[PDB]
Amino acid sequence: AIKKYKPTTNGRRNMTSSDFAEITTSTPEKSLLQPLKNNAGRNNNGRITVRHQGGGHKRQYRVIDFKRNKDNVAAVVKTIEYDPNRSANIALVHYEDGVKAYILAPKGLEVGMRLVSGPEADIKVGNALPLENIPVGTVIHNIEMKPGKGGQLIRSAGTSAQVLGKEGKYVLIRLNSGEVRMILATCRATIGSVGNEQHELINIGKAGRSRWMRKRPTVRGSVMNPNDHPHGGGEGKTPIGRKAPVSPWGQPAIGYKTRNKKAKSDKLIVRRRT
Amino acid sequence: MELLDVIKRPVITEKSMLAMDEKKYTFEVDTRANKTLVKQAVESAFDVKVANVNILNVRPKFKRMGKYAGYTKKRRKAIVTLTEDSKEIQL
Amino acid sequence: MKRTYQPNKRKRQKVHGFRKRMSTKNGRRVLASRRRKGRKVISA
RNA sequence: GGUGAAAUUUUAGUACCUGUGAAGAUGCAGGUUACCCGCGACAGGACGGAAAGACCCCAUGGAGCUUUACUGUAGUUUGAU
RNA sequence: GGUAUGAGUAGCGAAAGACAGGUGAGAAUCCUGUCCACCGUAUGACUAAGGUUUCCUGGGGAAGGCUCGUCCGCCCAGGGUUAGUCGGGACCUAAGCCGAGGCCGAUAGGCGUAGGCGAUGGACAACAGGUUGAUAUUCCUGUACCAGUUGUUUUUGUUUGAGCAAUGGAGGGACGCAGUAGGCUAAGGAAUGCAUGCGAUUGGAAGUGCAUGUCCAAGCAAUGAGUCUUGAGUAGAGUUAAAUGCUUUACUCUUUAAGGACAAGUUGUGACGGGGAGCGAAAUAGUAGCGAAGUUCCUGACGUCACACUGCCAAGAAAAGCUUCUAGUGAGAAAACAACUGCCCGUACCGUAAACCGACACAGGUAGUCGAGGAGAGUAUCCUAAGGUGAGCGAGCGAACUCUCGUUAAGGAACUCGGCAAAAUGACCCCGUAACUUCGGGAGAAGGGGUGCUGACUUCGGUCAGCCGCAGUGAAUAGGCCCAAGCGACUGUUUAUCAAAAACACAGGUCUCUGCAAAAUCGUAAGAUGAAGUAUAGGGGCUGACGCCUGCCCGGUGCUGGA
RNA sequence: CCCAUGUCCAGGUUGAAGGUGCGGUAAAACGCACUGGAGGACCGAACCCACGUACGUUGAAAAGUGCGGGGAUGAGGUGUG
Ligand SMILES: [K+]
Ligand SMILES: [K+]
Ligand SMILES: [K+]
Ligand SMILES: [K+]
Ligand SMILES: [K+]
Ligand SMILES: [K+]
Ligand SMILES: [K+]
Ligand SMILES: [K+]
Ligand SMILES: [K+]
Ligand SMILES: [K+]
Ligand SMILES: [K+]
Ligand SMILES: [K+]
Ligand SMILES: [K+]
Ligand SMILES: [K+]
Ligand SMILES: [K+]
Ligand SMILES: [K+]
Ligand SMILES: [K+]
Ligand SMILES: [K+]
Ligand SMILES: [K+]
Ligand SMILES: [K+]
Ligand SMILES: [K+]
Ligand SMILES: [K+]
Ligand SMILES: [K+]
Ligand SMILES: [K+]
Ligand SMILES: [K+]
Ligand SMILES: [K+]
Ligand SMILES: [K+]
Ligand SMILES: [K+]
Ligand SMILES: [K+]
Ligand SMILES: [K+]
Ligand SMILES: [K+]
Ligand SMILES: [K+]
Ligand SMILES: [K+]
Ligand SMILES: [K+]
Ligand SMILES: [K+]
Ligand SMILES: [K+]
Ligand SMILES: [K+]
Ligand SMILES: [K+]
Ligand SMILES: [Mg+2]
Ligand SMILES: [Mg+2]
Ligand SMILES: [Mg+2]
Ligand SMILES: [Mg+2]
Ligand SMILES: [Mg+2]
Ligand SMILES: [Mg+2]
Ligand SMILES: [Mg+2]
Ligand SMILES: [Mg+2]
Ligand SMILES: [Mg+2]
Ligand SMILES: [Mg+2]
Ligand SMILES: [Mg+2]
Ligand SMILES: [Mg+2]
Ligand SMILES: [Mg+2]
Ligand SMILES: [Mg+2]
Ligand SMILES: [Mg+2]
Ligand SMILES: [Mg+2]
Ligand SMILES: [Mg+2]
Ligand SMILES: [Mg+2]
Ligand SMILES: [Mg+2]
Ligand SMILES: [Mg+2]
Ligand SMILES: [Mg+2]
Ligand SMILES: [Mg+2]
Ligand SMILES: [Mg+2]
Ligand SMILES: [Mg+2]
Ligand SMILES: [Mg+2]
Ligand SMILES: [Mg+2]
Ligand SMILES: [Mg+2]
Ligand SMILES: [Mg+2]
Ligand SMILES: [Mg+2]
Ligand SMILES: [Mg+2]
Ligand SMILES: [Mg+2]
Ligand SMILES: [Mg+2]
Ligand SMILES: [Mg+2]
Ligand SMILES: [Mg+2]
Ligand SMILES: [Mg+2]
Ligand SMILES: [Mg+2]
Ligand SMILES: [Mg+2]
Ligand SMILES: [Mg+2]
Ligand SMILES: [Mg+2]
Ligand SMILES: [Mg+2]
Ligand SMILES: [Mg+2]
Ligand SMILES: [Mg+2]
Ligand SMILES: [Mg+2]
Ligand SMILES: [Mg+2]
Ligand SMILES: [Mg+2]
Ligand SMILES: [Mg+2]
């Protein structure tokens, strides 16, 4: 649930946060933790390549089993855990043979559920099957784009996709964005939608909290100088004062499409959206 | 290096002379010699039994004569403590 | 009032030391220039 | 008593008034005042010092910036091969 | 380059000194003494960096020292830094860096795998005292510990083999923030507890007087306030090969326990030792040397148990050492005792500084630790303790003027662009406290009262009573307030060095791009960031909390689609 | 500006969520106490900052000092690499 803080301070005023009710532990699985340094938007040349990233809290990476290709044994859900690296929660599962893994927690997943993966798995939340084995109309997430590569699509909190049909070696899927496309039928997906649906409703509340979450401030181009931004300069506040608004590198910011016009996947995208 | 080249000379000063009263002998040693080498060199040169060797490095010291300025050579000082029931060194 | 030179033995060698000069082609050009000029000290 | 700089400085035995003059003179003219040398004070003048005016104009000077100035061009894209 | 002018002028860098005696050619300035004064969450004690001989001793007085100089961080001549245990290496890894082959590229080279390097982190064996002019957890004394070596004795194992043991399976190491409880111990305070020395002429005091001191390791042994943790068994799956190790699925019993794992500290031993008020020698100093007491009570640590517990969201290194498991390796192992071995580098000195960064023996800057007493919430404040300091020009005079500071009759903002500056407020307790509000606030609103001392009495906070002064947080240090308008919601951020703002940012809003080899960006490329992210995500434009709202125009220009 | 790894923030104050008890109710909402200890929370040293003013302006200082001033558990200060 979302808890609304009382306005004890102006910073606390209008702020909200999740009450983390679904989280059953705060002791992550040591075996599955890996270190990640904060790149702060800087690449192997040490240059800022993505603005507005850096600082904030330290994090340990939780190795998520996106492939879900262990089909022999079932895995019992042990915990629902907070994952600082993604908007969704993750579930610690113990395979009967003693192998431990993390998965994305689907909506409605509960501690104690027994999950299976493979062509013969039931159509149940948390089970992962090849798309060819999933009946049409089923809500799915964690869709892999290439066989054996692991889930890549529909992984953020509250997201879901739906199977629309089978044509050839491809399954017609509606993605979370509304786009309808073909995914290779040998690709696997997990049944259900991603949990933590309330994630989008959080009112961050104060600037410091965004800094905790590794976001550095955005400066508007209009309040820069002309040598910094096409919107820079002018006396006083100014309008855009150009044909169209542009990025710092002169690329139109309202409406101009940036997808490669010769994309290979265009053959596989049936109906676009976003 | 030869054992006979490890030990360069004794050190005769108020401090070293005082230390001789405690049966420990100060020598200038080759700058590259470890205190184990010094122990072996001392025993072969003097027939004494060595209890302990302490060793220090002495930094080169700034000095000037007239218009010319430079540095004295770096040194390595070894204080060699002989055992009881052992012959002393007579320098 | 903190001034520009904040001495540090290690950083002097790492940035200006002999091995830093030798590890780049332009660093060796510096040492070649200092030697050509006849500097008593070619590296820092 | 001890120690001891600096900016400045063509040479200076370096008054006032009215006038004159590159048109606002300690220095020129006429007249007036004024024994020689300092010390503590004050700043009206020396168009005082400091900076080869920044305003203004000019130089077929410079630089940064803009754009539907000109000419190009990275990138992007389309076709042929 | 030399030398003038200004000049014998500005300046001599934030502060207390005085006198006696000494030294010496010469002394306000060097030494000694005495009193005085200054710092004391320090101007004390350490230590990292940095410096790099500045440390010590003996001489010196050209230059340096803003004066002087017999003196000095200066000059000359000698000397000084001692470690198996401290810090670093022969241990470990982070960021980052380097990078066999490799990938990429006019050249040059760029990137990068294995593999390494790299602490600011992990790991890791001794302490107290003494000693020198100068070093000491380094030397010495006492008493330890860690790794290993040789030998002696004792046990048990010789291939149905104890033991050793992986680079391999594991476990472990291993981690955030905030909040208070609790335990212990530094530490602090008190005392007619104890010890030692004293009776003080300036009126009084031999007792409830004064001054001083009032306990000590590591190791070892024994314990220990406490802390955390369920413990089994059956059947199965696993753990690239194996396992008795470890992971795990089910299922029986247990769980106010039980067993296990940890633990500050305490007591004893170390210690017949060492320190210790003080007393105090000669053959010339307070130095040998000698040496008393070590109790109680009060306070009591965010120091330690210990990130133990609780809560929180922003969710909080790695690797080795280490411990196990077999696989392998094995003929010998282990214990006790004795003797013995253990390398390199640093280790002086300054270090809120005259010895570092600031051209200066410069009012600046410099990480970390300890940092006492009274009053006090306190590391504030004032005065002091331990300790340190009197700060490198002085002597007069007591004009203007300038600076810094104190007091002012009556008036009280008349000043001025403007109450600039100053004045006033200020602590604690109590009474009381408006519009407005997003219901939190606004508030410490405002406006008032009390505060010393001494007895009596107490429900321990007062109450009653008395007393003195102009005045009782009697000094120091701790808000001036209120009404109203603009702008910005707010805490934040900015033009280092003339602008701190109404500017930026912000949470929120909206638009748009982006289906993942994403868009976007760095790059010729390879390779990266975005992301070990995946449309509730990521990039870009604009707006800028919140509340109420955001109308009309698509002709033009862009974008999107069409074709 | 960022990365990795350390470290610092005397002492007071306020009293959010949650919890408990007793009221209330068919059950509730909800009211009152207590407990609880949130915050780019409050007052205030160190620490960081630099708002006013005087002074300085051949400075003690190539930007400071004096008296006041703001932040001071954070979008915090700061060390090392
Ligand atoms: K807010
Ligand atoms: K999360
Ligand atoms: K912005
Ligand atoms: K503008
Ligand atoms: K030179
Ligand atoms: K003229
Ligand atoms: K004048
Ligand atoms: K310019
Ligand atoms: K001159
Ligand atoms: K002169
Ligand atoms: K002398
Ligand atoms: K060592
Ligand atoms: K270290
Ligand atoms: K073993
Ligand atoms: K020890
Ligand atoms: K003991
Ligand atoms: K030392
Ligand atoms: K007190
Ligand atoms: K105090
Ligand atoms: K002096
Ligand atoms: K006078
Ligand atoms: K005056
Ligand atoms: K007046
Ligand atoms: K008010
Ligand atoms: K009174
Ligand atoms: K106040
Ligand atoms: K503003
Ligand atoms: K704002
Ligand atoms: K507004
Ligand atoms: K401000
Ligand atoms: K700004
Ligand atoms: K709005
Ligand atoms: K936006
Ligand atoms: K706009
Ligand atoms: K925004
Ligand atoms: K239009
Ligand atoms: K149009
Ligand atoms: K000031
Ligand atoms: Mg952005
Ligand atoms: Mg601007
Ligand atoms: Mg432009
Ligand atoms: Mg513009
Ligand atoms: Mg305008
Ligand atoms: Mg040594
Ligand atoms: Mg005329
Ligand atoms: Mg005239
Ligand atoms: Mg004449
Ligand atoms: Mg004439
Ligand atoms: Mg002039
Ligand atoms: Mg000119
Ligand atoms: Mg003069
Ligand atoms: Mg002085
Ligand atoms: Mg004082
Ligand atoms: Mg103080
Ligand atoms: Mg000296
Ligand atoms: Mg001397
Ligand atoms: Mg002199
Ligand atoms: Mg070490
Ligand atoms: Mg490389
Ligand atoms: Mg190569
Ligand atoms: Mg590697
Ligand atoms: Mg150790
Ligand atoms: Mg010393
Ligand atoms: Mg008397
Ligand atoms: Mg196996
Ligand atoms: Mg405690
Ligand atoms: Mg020392
Ligand atoms: Mg100084
Ligand atoms: Mg008056
Ligand atoms: Mg009056
Ligand atoms: Mg007026
Ligand atoms: Mg007037
Ligand atoms: Mg004022
Ligand atoms: Mg007072
Ligand atoms: Mg504002
Ligand atoms: Mg502010
Ligand atoms: Mg400025
Ligand atoms: Mg300013
Ligand atoms: Mg705006
Ligand atoms: Mg605050
Ligand atoms: Mg404050
Ligand atoms: Mg500082
Ligand atoms: Mg600033
Ligand atoms: Mg404030």
Residue numbers in the entry:
A (entry chain G): 2 to 275
B (entry chain W): 1 to 91
C (entry chain 6): 1 to 44
What is written in the article reporting this PDB entry?
Therefore, we focused on the PotxA(EF9F6)-EQ2–70S sample and subjected it to structural analysis using single-particle cryo-EM. Using a Titan Krios transmission electron microscope with a K2 direct electron detector, we collected 3640 micrographs which, after 2D classification, yielded 140,310 ribosomal particles. In silico sorting revealed that 80% of these particles contained an additional density for PoxtA and/or tRNAs, which after 3D refinement resulted in a cryo-EM map of E. faecalis 70S ribosome with an average resolution of 2.4 Å. Subsequent multibody refinement yielded average resolutions of 2.2 Å and 2.5 Å for the LSU and SSU, respectively. The increase in resolution compared to the previous E. faecalis 70S ribosome models at 2.8–2.9 Å15,37 is evident from improved quality and features of the cryo-EM density, including visualisation of some rRNA modifications (e.g. N2-methylguanosine), water molecules and hydrated magnesium ions. The best-resolved region of PoxtA was the ARD, consisting of two α-helices (α1 and α2) and the ARD loop, where the majority of sidechains could be modelled unambiguously. In particular, two glutamine residues, Gln275 and Gln279, located at the distal end of the α-helix α1 of the ARD insert into the minor groove of the acceptor’s arm where hydrogen bond interactions can form with the C3-G70 basepair. Ser281 is within H-bonding distance to the phosphate-oxygen of A73, whereas the sidechain of Gln282 stacks upon the base of C74 and can interact with the ribose-hydroxyl of A72. The ARD is stabilised by multiple contacts between residues within α-helix α2 and rRNA nucleotides located in H74 and H93. For example, the sidechains of Arg294 and Arg297 contact nucleotides A2595–G2598 (E. coli numbering used throughout) located within the loop of H93 of the 23S rRNA, and Glu293 interacts with G2597 directly as well as G2598 via a putative water molecule.
